[PDB]
Amino acid sequence: REDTPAGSVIQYSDYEIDYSSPFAGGVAWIEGEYLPAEDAKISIFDTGFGHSDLTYTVAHVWHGNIFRLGDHLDRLLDGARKLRLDSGYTKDELADITKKCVSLSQLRESFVNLTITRGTHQVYIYAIPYLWAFPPAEQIFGTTAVVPRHVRRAGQWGDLTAASFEAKDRGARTAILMDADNCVAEGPGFNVCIVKDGKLASPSRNALPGITRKTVFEIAGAMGIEAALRDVTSHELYDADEIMAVTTAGGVTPINTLDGVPIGDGEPGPVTVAIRDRFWALMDEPGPLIEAIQY
Amino acid sequence: REDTPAGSVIQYSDYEIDYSSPFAGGVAWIEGEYLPAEDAKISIFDTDLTYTVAHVWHGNIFRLGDHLDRLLDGARKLRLDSGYTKDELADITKKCVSLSQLRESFVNLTITTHQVYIYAIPYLWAFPPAEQIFGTTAVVPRHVRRQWGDLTAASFEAKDRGARTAILMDADNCVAEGPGFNVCIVKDGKLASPSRPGITRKTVFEIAGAMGIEAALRDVTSHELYDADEIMAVTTAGGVTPINTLDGVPIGDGEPGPVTVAIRDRFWALMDEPGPLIEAIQY
Numbered sequence A: 001r002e003d004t005p006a007g008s009v010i011q012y013s014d015y016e017i018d019y020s021s022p023f024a025g026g027v028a029w030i031e032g033e034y035l036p037a038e039d040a041k042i043s044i045f046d047t048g049f050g051h052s053d054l055t056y057t058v059a060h061v062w063h064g065n066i067f068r069l070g071d072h073l074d075r076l077l078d079g080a081r082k083l084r085l086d087s088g089y090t091k092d093e094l095a096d097i098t099k100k101c102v103s104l105s106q107l108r109e110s111f112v113n114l115t116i117t118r119g120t121h122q123v124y125i126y127a128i129p130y131l132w133a134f135p136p137a138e139q140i141f142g143t144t145a146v147v148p149r150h151v152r153r154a155g156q157w158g159d160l161t162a163a164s165f166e167a168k169d170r171g172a173r174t175a176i177l178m179d180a181d182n183c184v185a186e187g188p189g190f191n192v193c194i195v196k197d198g199k200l201a202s203p204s205r206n207a208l209p210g211i212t213r214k215t216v217f218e219i220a221g222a223m224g225i226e227a228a229l230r231d232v233t234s235h236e237l238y239d240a241d242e243i244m245a246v247t248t249a250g251g252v253t254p255i256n257t258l259d260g261v262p263i264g265d266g267e268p269g270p271v272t273v274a275i276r277d278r279f280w281a282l283m284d285e286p287g288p289l290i291e292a293i294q295y
Numbered sequence B: 001r002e003d004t005p006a007g008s009v010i011q012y013s014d015y016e017i018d019y020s021s022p023f024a025g026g027v028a029w030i031e032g033e034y035l036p037a038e039d040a041k042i043s044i045f046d047t048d049l050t051y052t053v054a055h056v057w058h059g060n061i062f063r064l065g066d067h068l069d070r071l072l073d074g075a076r077k078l079r080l081d082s083g084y085t086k087d088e089l090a091d092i093t094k095k096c097v098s099l100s101q102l103r104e105s106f107v108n109l110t111i112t113t114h115q116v117y118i119y120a121i122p123y124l125w126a127f128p129p130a131e132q133i134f135g136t137t138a139v140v141p142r143h144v145r146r147q148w149g150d151l152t153a154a155s156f157e158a159k160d161r162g163a164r165t166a167i168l169m170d171a172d173n174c175v176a177e178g179p180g181f182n183v184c185i186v187k188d189g190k191l192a193s194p195s196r197p198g199i200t201r202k203t204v205f206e207i208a209g210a211m212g213i214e215a216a217l218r219d220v221t222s223h224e225l226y227d228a229d230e231i232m233a234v235t236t237a238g239g240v241t242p243i244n245t246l247d248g249v250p251i252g253d254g255e256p257g258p259v260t261v262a263i264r265d266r267f268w269a270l271m272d273e274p275g276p277l278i279e280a281i282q283y
Helices: A069-082 A091-105 A136-141 A157-169 A212-222 A234-238 A270-281 B064-076 B086-100 B129-134 B148-160 B200-209 B222-227 B258-272
Strands: A027-030 A033-036 A041-043 A054-062 A065-067 A110-118 A121-129 A143-146 A184-186 A191-196 A199-202 A227-229 A242-247 A251-258 A290-292 B027-030 B033-036 B041-043 B050-057 B060-062 B105-111 B116-122 B136-139 B175-177 B182-187 B190-194 B215-218 B230-235 B239-246 B278-280
Touching: A027 A091, A033 A091, A054 A069, A065 A091, A069 A091, A069 A110, A091 A110, A091 A121, A136 A251, A143 A157, A184 A191, A184 A234, A191 A212, A191 A234, A199 A212, A212 A227, A212 A242, A212 A251, A212 A270, A242 A270, A251 A270, B027 B086, B033 B086, B050 B064, B060 B086, B060 B258, B064 B086, B064 B105, B086 B105, B086 B116, B129 B239, B136 B148, B175 B182, B175 B190, B175 B222, B182 B200, B182 B222, B190 B200, B200 B215, B200 B230, B200 B239, B200 B258, B230 B258, B239 B258
Parallel strands: A143 A251, A199 A227, B136 B239, B190 B215
Antiparallel strands: A027 A033, A027 A121, A041 B041, A054 A065, A054 A110, A065 A290, A110 A121, A191 A199, A191 A242, A242 A251, B027 B033, B027 B116, B050 B060, B050 B105, B060 B278, B105 B116, B182 B190, B182 B230, B230 B239
């Protein structure tokens, strides 16, 4: 189930999956049917994947709790209305379906996807094992990044793969891509936040579907930290007090070094750590942000 | 197989489909395998891509050469491996149409590990044959400017206003497109279409050039649309469709314009005329 550092804010649930169920380990709901993830197949005529005509969001489940399911459905449905996608289901129906996908999977730790496409409009929901852009150890102890020399954004998951390969060839774990106008764009599968003089900044691109950075901004807010979506300059990145990766697939990752240069002392920054540890604490704290899945 | 108007330039091949083939009526090719259309499914996890749309009419596939050139050119951008060559995709494409037994077919090539999907299904109409011949009604939406979100909203406003279709403007008050088509206007024996996955428009411009009609890709203003002599829709799914009225007011004499009719009748004749553009399909 992936090992996590002992005594760390990151711990998997302790429990037994009954694999006699064909649903164990991954459930996808397609066309009114809950089916094992392995057998979940979508028509080639779905003009969503065929012609990028879809809305989607990604959620997560941790310790049997699904995080901010309501906010995810509002965001998915908002997107549905802008694209004139009528799912045919209500918010409550989509909620019960998402929760049943997780329940039938038996996963206490799960990566969840909700998609609405133009098929007659189609809804696809899946719950599969929890996904890491960075392993648990790196979430705790921090990772290493470079700015690619051989790929920029404009001011394409191909760029992101190349950026990642170049990082690994230069002996770092990940890339922070810049754009044409020398502003921070993003990482392969994450957004970047910088901390400078107790303020937090993240690019305005908002490519990622998830709600993790919104949670980071709200956590920063409740910590008295000014947090802003805006253009982040090359200068701001290389002069940042802290840099962090933010994504649904692993949460908040300290970035210890950029182009082999330590950021602060070359260890996770104090604001990165406070936000990260709060994020994981939220997964066990009764309140509006979580619902327990019934297994 | 969809009725067409009697005596019109639009007539389906006359033939019976052998449904003893599981491939009859529509076929998909997915990474090595030919499948009945209905069986053409991919993993949800598999669900960055380029694609082109083409058509077959009277057993002839239209401009597959130029479609494949367009498709591969697109593949190098987005860093997507072709996996196969042009001659190979060409064979696979003609084989899908052949196996489908469809003389009239809508065909799609997509490149998205690399995945290549090809299919041939029954021919798709943006506008029914009756409107391809007798023309249709349009409005400029007041609540949507220039995403199938916009074009679906345009379409909803058009129907709400009693019209068959919408012609969207951009924030610059220039003509963008309709839902599923490019707009061409005729003014003073000149053809114009807005400077914005089908070779149907390029085909209209080459037909227009060959009739001694200037044709320009440029900015068309709202005022040029309302003042046009003729308005037509252009798309792979149905070809060239006259627009007889705009905001309830007839364009011209309230019937298909003569350039529209000339270009339209020439496009349908291209399918039946042997040459570089059309290749007969071995069924």
